[PDB]
Structures are given as C-alpha cells and as structure tokens.
C-alpha cells in the first residue's frame, strides 16, 4: 500500500491545495501521499536528512543549491501562486495599475505608509527583494516604513488601521476580504507583475544521497502533477471561490 513522504511548506499547507490533490493522486496512482509542512529551510533539511522522498517548495535559489549539493535530482516547475500590493481604495499614492517598481517608488516618493512583516518570513524576504529593484534607496530607515514583526493577517490589519499599503500573498488577502463580507477597506492595487510570482517546484530526493528513497513513487507524483489533467485541476482550484494557482509545467 505504497506511501510517498513529502516535505513542504507551512504556506503550502495553509492553501489547502494538497488536501484536494492528495485523494485524487491516490485514486489515480494507488500511492498514498503523506506530507509534513514546515518552514522552507527545515523542509530542505528534511530532504538532506533523508527523512522524505520529495520536496514541494517555492524557493528557487535554495532549491538550486539543494540540487547542486546532490541532495535532489532536479527541480520540476509545476505552478505558481502570487503576491499583491494592497492599499486603501482611495489609493492616496495613486499606484493602482502601476508596475511593482513604479508603485514602490511612488509610495517612497510620496512618503506613503508601507507596512512590512519585519519577521524574516518567506513573505518578508519577498517584500525586501522587491525594494531591491527600485532605483531609489532602501526604505528601512524611513518613518513611513512600518515593520510589524507579526504575521500576515496582523500586518494587513495594521495597514488598514494606518491607511497604508502592504504586500501580501493573495491567499491571505482572499481570506481577509471574506472576513469583511467582500468589502474590506484595502483593495488589490498592484498585481500581475512577473516579479510577484511564487514559483513552485517538485524535487525528488536523490538516491545517491539517500539510497533507500522511494524515487519511483516520487517520480510518479511529478509525472502526475505535470500531466495536463492535474495542471487543469491545479488551475481550477479555488480558495473561497477565487483562483490561486496558475499551472505552468513545461
Ligand atoms: Cl507603471
Ligand atoms: Cl502569517
Ligand atoms: Na522620503
């Protein structure tokens, strides 16, 4: 009764995608998928310690280092979710429909309130990376730049209280927008930019590093997830009725 063991991330688990996919994978392939959801570093460490057969993660540089170490065979890209910048509907900096770089530069130029996670999360790291691409200086010392040291929902709530802008994953936005009966005060103002993509890949753990790894089960999962039918299933997945993942297997 074959069992495939996966390490993935807390954010992944929170979307609920695997709760939908896993019974379909078992129907189609006979293989039971078990997963543990941890931070990215810890997931990678689980693969390095031979704890699991496959990773499903969303951190391209660390993933490339994992493969280069010989701990994984290769990255297969599968889908992405995305990040958005939100702010008051009135949009006091006037950034709606700008690119990320123009919006962040404009917020910086207008000294508009911008709220960071400030907690070294994956989301925080993504937000910091965005600033690295404006022409102007790092915002970290500016009084308009707020660092909560809190999670995503809390940080959204501070941006709402302050009339501020913030970067969020779309999933948490969708849940927050539903908590305000579809009419929160903060709206999605910047979205679609390629830099805001959160690319997922699967990586089989390498049998040269972990000789008892269930490579053939891992490869079956990759095959399944990259198939047109499961791609379509990922693209049709909804969170509270709204789209979250774009399939993009090669
Ligand atoms: Cl623009
Ligand atoms: Cl959070
Ligand atoms: Na300034």
Author numbering: 2 to 251
From the paper:
The modA/tupA/wtpA gene encodes a periplasmic molybdate/tungstate-binding protein (protein A) which constitutes the first selection gate from which cells should differentiate between Mo and W. The ModA, WtpA, and TupA proteins differ in their binding affinity for molybdate versus tungstate, primary sequence and oxoanion coordination chemistry. The present work reports the 1.40 Å crystal structure of the recombinant apo-form of TupA protein from the sulfate reducing bacteria Desulfovibro alaskensis G20 (DaG20 TupA) together with the biochemical characterization of three variants: R118K, R118E and R118Q. X-ray crystallography and SAXS, reveals that TupA architecture has a common feature with other substrate binding proteins, which is the existence of two separate lobes.
TupA is a globular protein with approximate dimensions of 55.7 × 34.5 × 23.8 Å. The protein has a butterfly shape with a central beta strand (T77-P89) that supports two lobes (lobe A: A2-R76 and Y201-E251; lobe B: A91-Q200). The central beta strand is hydrogen bonded to three beta strands of each of the lobes forming two 4-stranded beta sheets. The TupA metal binding site is located in a central cleft assembled by the two lobes. In DaG20 TupA, the cleft is decorated with positively charged residues as seen by the electrostatic surface potential calculations. The pronounced positive environment of the pocket must be an advantage to enable capture of the oxyanion, even when the extracellular concentration is low. Moreover, one chloride anion, arising from the crystallization conditions, was found at 3.8 Å from R118, indicating the propensity of the pocket to attract negatively charged ions. In this GsTupA-W6+ holo form, the central cleft volume (363.9 Å3) is four times smaller than the apo form of DaG20 TupA here reported (1480 Å3). The apo-form model was created by refining the initial BUNCH model with the SREFLEX program. This approach revealed a slight opening of the lobes (RMSD of 1.5 Å for 274 Cα atoms) yielding an excellent agreement to the TupA SAXS data measured in the absence of tungstate or molybdate (χ2 = 1.0). The SAXS data corroborate the hypothesis that DaG20 TupA is a flexible protein that is able to adopt a loose conformation in the free form but, when binding to molybdate or tungstate, switches to a more compact fold.
